[PDB]
Amino acid sequence: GQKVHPNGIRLGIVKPWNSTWFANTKEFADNLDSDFKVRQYLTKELAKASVSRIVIERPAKSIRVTIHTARPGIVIGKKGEDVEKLRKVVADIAGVPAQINIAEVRKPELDAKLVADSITSQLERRVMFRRAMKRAVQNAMRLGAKGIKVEVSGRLGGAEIARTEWYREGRVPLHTLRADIDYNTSEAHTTYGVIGVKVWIFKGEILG
Amino acid sequence: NQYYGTGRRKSSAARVFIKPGNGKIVINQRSLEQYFGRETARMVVRQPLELVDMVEKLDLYITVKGGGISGQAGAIRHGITRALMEYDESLRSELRKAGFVTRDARQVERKKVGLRKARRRPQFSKR
Amino acid sequence: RIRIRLKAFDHRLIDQATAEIVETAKRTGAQVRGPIPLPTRKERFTVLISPHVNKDARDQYEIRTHLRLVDIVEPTEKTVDALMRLDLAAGVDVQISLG
Amino acid sequence: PRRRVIGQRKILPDPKFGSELLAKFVNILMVDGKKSTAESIVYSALETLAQRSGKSELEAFEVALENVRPTVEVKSRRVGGSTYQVPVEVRPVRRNALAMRWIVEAARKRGDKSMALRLANELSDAAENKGTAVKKREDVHRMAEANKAFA
Amino acid sequence: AKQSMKAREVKRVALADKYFAKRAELKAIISDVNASDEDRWNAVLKLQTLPRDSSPSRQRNRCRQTGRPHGFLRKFGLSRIKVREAAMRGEIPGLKKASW
Amino acid sequence: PRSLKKGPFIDLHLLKKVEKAVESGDKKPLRTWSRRSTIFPNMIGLTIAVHNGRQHVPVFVTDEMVGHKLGEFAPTRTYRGHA
RNA sequence: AGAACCUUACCUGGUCUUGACAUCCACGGAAGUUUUCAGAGAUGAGAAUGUGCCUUCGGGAACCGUGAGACAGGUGCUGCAUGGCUGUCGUCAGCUCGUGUUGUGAAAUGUUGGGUUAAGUCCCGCAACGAGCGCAACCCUUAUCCUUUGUUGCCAGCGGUCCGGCCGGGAACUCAAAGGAGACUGCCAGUGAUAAACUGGAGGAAGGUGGGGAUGACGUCAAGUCAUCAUGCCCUUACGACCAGGGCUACACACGUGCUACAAUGGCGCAUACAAAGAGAAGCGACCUCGCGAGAGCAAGCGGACCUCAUAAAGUGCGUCGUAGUCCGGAUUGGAGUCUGCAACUCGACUCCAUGAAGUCGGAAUCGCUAGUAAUCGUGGAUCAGAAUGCCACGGUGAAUACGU
């Protein structure tokens, strides 16, 4: 298990946190669980909607969620119809007043998590994993990524002996802390087993 | 009129102040002999003064916190030297020569996972 | 006198919050004491990172809880009352206490 | 080491007499980082020795040292099938230290009661050219002499 | 861990919640030196009568996600493994890798 | 051992049983699992077959046995010898 | 990162079978609350209360009850089907690619060569020209300074004093964070190929990567983990579920890792000094009173730079013991007890009194460590009702040696 997690190592400098709130040792674990629950719910709901990042943020006994999704209107549906429904169940999950915001993701080809999800979907519907991977890399590059790497592992093409294959293009510095490396992961539950997909996308270096 | 120098060594933080006088040293409202039972500590606190013959010429009031004894004494000496520097500014060279101006940055190395100490590896065995 | 205890994990955020409360205070009232930094609480944690067994394999996290003590010497009518409507940025637990 | 030689670290002279050699000796004597006790022991011995032999404290200690310093030691080269001990001229810094270490080992070995007293007896013996440290010194010399053919 | 174990624990927690007042009162009675001997005996027997799962010292802290008994942490309510995942993924606020 | 202020320990049901046997004046062995139960004065004379994990082993009570517990007289492990 | 129960996955018995855990209807009952006997308990039988959100009244959503099945459940097997995570060589300086060129080709070149570097580090050359992942830097921390802000932190100079920063106060100093400065072979000399560098010195708190951490390239070991989790055959009135007791603590033995020792650089007794870093509400618990003591009683202060844990120990001074299996050493066993806890038999910790094994520095052999390191001394934390000599942290004192390959 060689490598460090690219988000995790950068949370202090170039990457921010997802859950963004304060408490006392009393109420932490409870809120962590609440976050887990809501996030799980939202993943379940907005699977067909391309959602990248749920950001929970709870001030003053009221939870504010922010959903970063590529196509809002499917999450929104009719104006203020679907969002509202989501809000009440979120409140229930938490046990507090809920407030949902929806951030619209520009360039879903450059968002690593979305790409991984797409690749997973492709794998599920029985395409050539290699071709999916090339599509991913190529699209990202077209869109203006300074670099991208993707990796897929296990039971590729239903083969008995599992193996991993990866495709890099551009430059993807991981040891460099100040580099904006959006990393994410997904899993394809195929007939032959799980296939793990990692993707790194290098949006460039920050100077501060 | 009193001149001043901060002293710092392992986890000790001395506050040395220099005044003109006869040469009586007070450390936390105690004499040098009272506070430092160890001779080595007495020596190290005095050293800068021996180097530049200003032992009888000036009194000094000190208050020191943190660390043990030897580290406290070193911090005191550092504060003394700083206060000498501030006071004369023509004594810098000999203090440099002696090695007093230098802050001894040696802190204790933290304990590291895997290891029993900073560097002591647990007992190895092939079998 | 109103002591105010700002607590947060992010230090830039807490600083921003300290500033903002200070402004709120200063316009209405007079003689804001000041934004005194108390010690930070660095709560550390060690964990085994292997799923099953590798004991020397470990990760050491921490949470840096930052404290800011802001004080108001003269509570006027307008000043204390401002704060009620002036909520701060999230992830910053404030704690006011008069007297 | 392979790559770089390094400069020896700074050592402070002892408070009582203001000397580097004595400080080194006390360091050698010490155990478990317990300096104050070891240097008290060293001082006690020194005082007893001074009483016994007259001369200054320091001077007597130096004399005793002189009598256990080695001119030559031996090291194992072993280029051949069997091993060959080869004499080598031991440098000023090292020889002094060796004599110290040798005195201290003798003190450890002796049968007297207090550590300081034992050290004192050892120093007296070295001055007189008996004891343990002088014997070991002799043995070192003797080995070198035997292997003088190698050079 | 299994579902069954999680269920058992939930039950135990419920029971602790239920019988806290009574059990605490009984403990107090038993402790109270300024009290009758027979009363003390009644109290200890009564404690015996109450259910065993009522005790707080029966319940084991598990991971709130996996139910793993070992490797637990209190602040987060999670086992080491899931906690680490949380730190990496950004969902624990304030937590980041520490070096000094 | 248990605190003096707490008193001795005996399982309630076992105590009950003992009381009944006393009332009856019968000497039929009482099978019991309460190995942790202390032994009392009134139980002297009774046979009480204590569980040892596997089976109930009869224990005829004696005056000497009072302060002890029932499990002390019902060894659980069965080691004969290594050869 | 903590087996008395629990945990537990194991054994023995006692029990259940759409089920402890979910969804689904049908239809019986508001959920729930209190209490009774038998039972080791699991469970199996009794007495009191309620009817809330709405009905062209064939009833509903929460929460119990019964039967059918669809299903639940599995810490069951396969890590040699897998994902994820982890170790490892190894923080070793390497591993590659594109285009070009050489070769029938596998391939080669680049990436070799002269120097140099911690470094595939840098320069110079050269059928190579370029690029990427890595060796570096960006991050944390530590070492010097400055600015800002001064309480719960500080007391230099002022007044008062109960001689306590405690109280007027002061914002200096320490300290606390926030933001800046600072180190780059930048400056000097020499050597060097008109170089990259190296050797020395100046300044400086710091000098040549300043010290430490995080950071682990392509890959290797069908390395580990299906018992965290997820995931692609088997069990389903039992390989599932509930209970009480037992076991995981067994004991001719062998090995691993530690602690304590064998003593006088010490033991014991009396006095006495100097830390850091943490934790704390089903919590830390002062003071005072009682207890030889573990503790008990009463009970402030405190979600805490404020109060508590909380006396640092080694040390220093004075006395004693005088080389003894000892005033060394504490195992072991007997008595009596304290606390946690339904519960200390199996099987907790600690206390008091007694008891006082082996052991006098350890065969072959074998491990660690280059500096605030080793060695030694204490302190804290996690898990945690209780239960560390382990683990993870913190400071105290503080060496030896490096000729060299």
Q: Where are the domains of chain F?
A: 2-82
Residue identified by tokens 């029985």 is: A126
Could you give the CA distance from residue F66 to residue F83 in angstroms, rounded to a whole number? 37
Q: Are A134 and A198 in contact (CB under 8 A)?
A: no
Tell me the CA–C1' distance in angstroms for D67 and G341. 72
Query: Nearest CA of chain A to the CA of E85: how many Å?
Result: 9
Q: Whose CA is closest to B46, among B25, B20, B18? A: B25
Specify the nucleotide whose C1' lies closest to residue F35 (CA): G345
User: Is any Cβ of chain F less than 8 angstroms from the Cβ of E88?
Assistant: no
Instruction: Count the neighbouring beta carbons within 10 Å of the beta carbon of residue A92.
Output: 13
Q: Which residues span the domain enclosing B11?
A: 1-127
Using DSSP's 3-state secondary structure scheme, residue E59 falls into coil
Task: Please judge whether E76 and A28 are an interchain contact, meaning their C-beta atoms are less than 8 angstroms apart.
Answer: yes
Could you give the CA distance from residue D47 to residue D119 in angstroms, rounded to a whole number? 11
User: Is any Cβ of chain F less than 8 angstroms from the Cβ of E45?
Assistant: yes
- A-chain CB neighbours of C9 within 8 Å are 22
Q: Are B102 and B7 in contact (CB under 8 A)?
A: no
In A, minimum Cα distance to C50 occurs at A1
Region of F75 please: left (phi>0), alpha (psi -120 to 50) or beta: beta
Q: Which two tokens stand for residue F18?
A: 């003992």
Domains by residue range for chain D, with CATH:
20-147 (1.10.455.10)
**Amino acid letter for position A74:** I
Residue identified by tokens 């009675």 is: E29
Using DSSP's 3-state secondary structure scheme, residue A146 falls into coil
User: What DSSP designation does A158 have?
Assistant: G
φ, ψ of residue D73 to 5 degrees: the values are -125, -175
C-alpha triplet B54, D13, D43: angle, nearest 5°: 115
Could you give the CA distance from residue A200 to residue A169 in angstroms, rounded to a whole number? 11
Domain range list for chain A: 16-106, 107-206
Q: Are B84 and B58 in contact (CB under 8 A)?
A: no
Kindly write down the DSSP assignment for every residue of F14-83, as one continuous string: HHHHHHHHHHHT--PPEEE--TTPBP-STTTT-EEEEE-SSSEEEEE--GGGTTSBGGGGS---------
C-alpha triplet A188, A191, A194: angle, nearest 5°: 35
* Dihedral (CA of E49, E52, E53, E58) sign: positive
User: Is any Cβ of chain A less than 8 angstroms from the Cβ of C40?
Assistant: no
Q: Are A179 and A204 in contact (CB under 8 A)?
A: yes
In E, minimum Cα distance to C50 occurs at E81
The pairing of strands B12-20 and B58-65 is antiparallel
The pairing of strands D85-89 and B3-9 is unpaired
- A-chain CB neighbours of C92 within 8 Å are 22
Tell me the CA–C1' distance in angstroms for B123 and G251. 28
Domain range list for chain E: 1-90
H or E element that contains B10: none
Instruction: Count the neighbouring beta carbons within 10 Å of the beta carbon of residue C16.
Output: 15
Residue F10 Cα distances to A179, E25, E29, F19, F37, angstroms: 71, 23, 20, 12, 4
Integer-rounded Cα radius of gyration of chain D: 17
Using DSSP's 3-state secondary structure scheme, residue A74 falls into helix
- E-chain CB neighbours of A35 within 8 Å are 91
Tell me the CA–C1' distance in angstroms for A174 and G276. 37
Alpha-helical regions (H) of D9-132: 20-29, 35-53, 57-66, 92-109, 115-128
Smallest Cα–C1' distance to nucleotide G229: which residue has it? Answer: E66
**A12 Cβ contact partners less than 8 Å away, ≥ 6 residues apart:** E96
Query: Nearest CA of chain E to the CA of A16: how many Å?
Result: 8
Q: Are E40 and E29 in contact (CB under 8 A)?
A: yes
- C-chain CB neighbours of B114 within 8 Å are 56, 58
Residue F21 Cα distances to F13, F18, F26, F61, angstroms: 12, 5, 6, 14
Q: Whose CA is closest to A22, among E82, C92, F22? A: C92
Integer-rounded Cα radius of gyration of chain A: 18
**Amino acid letter for position A184:** N
Rounded to 10 degrees, the C-alpha dihedral E71/E77/E83/E89 comes to 170
Could you give the CA distance from residue A139 to residue A32 in angstroms, rounded to a whole number? 36
Could you give the CA distance from residue A20 to residue C47 in angstroms, rounded to a whole number? 23
Could you give the CA distance from residue B32 to residue B18 in angstroms, rounded to a whole number? 15
Smallest Cα–C1' distance to nucleotide G263: which residue has it? Answer: D113
**Amino acid letter for position B117:** K
Query: HSE-up of C25 (CA within 13 Å, CB side)?
Result: 23
The crossing angle, in degrees rounded to 10, of helices D133-146 and D92-109 is: 130
Could you give the CA distance from residue D110 to residue D103 in angstroms, rounded to a whole number? 11
Could you give the CA distance from residue E84 to residue A101 in angstroms, rounded to a whole number? 28
Q: Whose CA is closest to A77, among A107, A38, A46? A: A46
Could you give the CA distance from residue A198 to residue E88 in angstroms, rounded to a whole number? 14
Interface test with A, best of E88, E95, E99 (most A CBs within 10 A): E88
H or E element that contains B80: helix B70-88
- The burial class, CB within 10 Å (0-12 / 13-18 / 19+), for D132 is buried
Specify the nucleotide whose C1' lies closest to residue D44 (CA): G265
φ, ψ of residue D51 to 5 degrees: the values are -55, -45
Counted domains in chain B: 1
Over the range E55-90, which residues count as b (16 or more CB within 10 Å of their CB) and which as e?
Answer: eeeebeebbbbebeeeebbebbbbbbbbbbbbbbbb
**Amino acid letter for position B74:** G
Q: Are C98 and C72 in contact (CB under 8 A)?
A: no
Residue identified by tokens 């004399």 is: D63
Instruction: Count the neighbouring beta carbons within 10 Å of the beta carbon of residue A2.
Output: 3
Region of B120 please: left (phi>0), alpha (psi -120 to 50) or beta: beta
C-alpha triplet A103, A105, A108: angle, nearest 5°: 160
**D125 Cβ contact partners less than 8 Å away, ≥ 6 residues apart:** D106, D131, D132, D133, D134
**Gap sites in chain A (C to N > 2.5 Å), preceding residue numbers:** none
Q: Whose CA is closest to F5, among E40, B29, A27, B63? A: E40
Using DSSP's 3-state secondary structure scheme, residue A51 falls into strand
Resolution (A): 3.1
Over the range E24-35, which residues count as b (16 or more CB within 10 Å of their CB) and which as e?
Answer: eebeebbeeeee
